[PDB]
């Protein structure tokens with residue numbers, strides 16, 4: 001049980017990268033409860049987004065979320081070197097449970 005994400009994605013500096021997160025009607029599509037995490041290897045994960053498109057304070061305006069049907073997405077716009085990292089989604093899935101995505105390695109061209 002794991003949400004589907006592309007293994008990797010790339011973009012040029014200044015451009016954008018979009019990470020999808022696909023589940024089912026009982027998780028991604030059933031709730032507004034998608035989170036996104038950014039992790040550099042061997043560093044703690046950052047919370048980028050919760051509840052599809054809510055930013056904790058401190059996350060720049062260039063990070064946004066969208067959802068339609070059973071797919072949520074994170075876009076990192078205005079790409080910076082700083083943004084190269086693995087990105088993970090998760091969703092509530094009912095029954096007090098969460099499910100996580102497989103992660104996407106983002107690189108800059």
Ligand SMILES: CN(C)c1ccc2nc3ccc(N(C)C)cc3[s+]c2c1
Pocket residue numbers: 031032033092096097
């Ligand atoms: C019983 N235990 C400790 C917990 C732990 C975390 C939880 N998180 C949720 C988050 C979202 C939500 N929604 C219905 C969207 C439902 C829940 S229930 C829930 C139960």
